[PDB]
């Protein structure tokens, strides 16, 4: 029923930009939230950006604060993660996740709905 | 209930040696709930290890714990002179009850020392009061395992003797033991020969010291 | 940092009562559970009772259920143990310790002695050196310190001038309820007829001082 | 003013099985902040009858259970939230306060129970749980276990076994 559609990854040089997209389908209402988890090589899933949809309130970890921007386009029901000033640190598999709540969590297990990850690689 | 058995009962090592202490459990136990202690004579137990492998604040790094399931181990990589003491393990954490281990004593090591045996007749002033105590001294021997048997007219006594053992001497690492035979004055003057026989690792043959009641 | 200090422990006849106290300092007392643990002389550690902080649940070991009562006054940072209908088998060093699994820092440890006797000084009898039982040129002599209560006694030889080769054995509780121990010293047999040997026994509970001269038979 | 400092800045928290309840915005990224049935930006514009503040401590791997329609050891036997729960849940890593440096064995959890807990039910019973056929009669033995176990909060563990102080705000 509920389904998240991810796309937008690729290979980029240090300093470039990238736009990830998470398309949420079978949601009745606007009462859910989106989180972006990146899984570095050998690291655990770690949230980097959160968006409470009903309130349109973003949250970012400090390492991506001014470089990452999360927002939502209402028409296509899609959450976007604009990643600017990319560093080699940002290389990871990015996931978007959904839950029937308004807010944010560092715990992946708190999200009952996910999407298939997209690869983001930053090197020269 | 759970029973914690430590082995061996007495660990005899020299300073600088590696110590391996064992703690065996009657049931399988989550490694999160096992502790180790050090207790010195006259002191409260000082916590060494908790959670099978974690050292409390201040514990030197020569102490290391391991194990899971039913077998746990406390390892001392290098025995320092301050480390010779009594060590208990504990099955805390589960229920309020704090079951403790029986204890393993780590003492100093030494060459085998045969005991010097002495027998003391009861004093004439004590016999004035109706009791006769015969004292048998085992002086400066090692190891601690020693057998002391009282013979009264070549008849083996039982239930009328008590033993006391000294702590391992700091200077020569030997032990001493006193066995005291307590008889009434009437029973004491019924018999003639009083002997305590001593068997110890340092003695080729069991040594018997005796005196005849009334002789000089 | 943190430390505990106990008190109250003392001699008490069977059937009577006694209350122990445990004074805490250096931490927020009201946030921690407390445990009484005891240790009979020459034996191992036995858990007695716990006062949990969370709900206030009190748990007692089966040996002491109904006879002992644990309580606390957080405003005074004090833990108590009321011991009622005391028995001989309750004689032990009682340790105050945290409930923080396992226990981080313990207390001093008071000594509760439950016995039915009266304060009494020891009789001192000589353990005379033998004229023939010389073990390789060395002779043994000592003093039998018998029938006293309670612990302890101190034994010195020649007012402290003789300490080498001296062994003062631990006391044993006889079936009479009184203690008894021997203190011995090994000396050269050649000095038995020349050197005077005197054992100085002191028992402060009964205010008893005894000097017994030990001479060959 | 509503006593919110007494709950968040409290010196110690209660165990999850005996969770305390106190009858009564910007935060930071290291705070788990989930809300159910209501929006955070609208809390200043709403009046409620009663606001309950539940506080306790669990380990990191169990924060997922403090949520409506969840199952597990903590939700079923310690602290359960209803399916129509209206409120927010707040949690943060408190390893510097409830671990080895402090040494706070104030956080317990319930392991055995005959049935699940109803929403907002607190079970402080310490009766020997009967897991077999024979009656326990308060004796810890085979198929008769004490229903409370401990948390062994160590420093070496990785967030999943580290303490998290949870504050659940119910809006009635």
Tab-separated table of C-alpha atoms in Angstrom, chain D residues 7 11 37 43 46 51 71 74 84 103 113-114 119 131 140 155 166:
chain	number	residue	atom	x	y	z
D	7	UNK	CA	10.905	16.558	34.476
D	11	UNK	CA	18.619	14.478	38.556
D	37	UNK	CA	-2.168	12.879	16.662
D	43	UNK	CA	0.651	23.265	20.674
D	46	UNK	CA	-4.502	24.615	22.017
D	51	UNK	CA	-1.127	17.139	30.580
D	71	UNK	CA	5.151	-4.693	20.334
D	74	UNK	CA	9.057	-2.767	26.920
D	84	UNK	CA	-5.158	6.594	19.548
D	103	UNK	CA	26.807	4.203	38.380
D	113	UNK	CA	4.258	-11.253	32.688
D	114	UNK	CA	1.173	-13.401	32.210
D	119	UNK	CA	-2.482	1.385	27.740
D	131	UNK	CA	6.278	-20.178	33.809
D	140	UNK	CA	12.866	-18.617	42.740
D	155	UNK	CA	30.664	2.523	28.489
D	166	UNK	CA	12.405	9.190	27.726
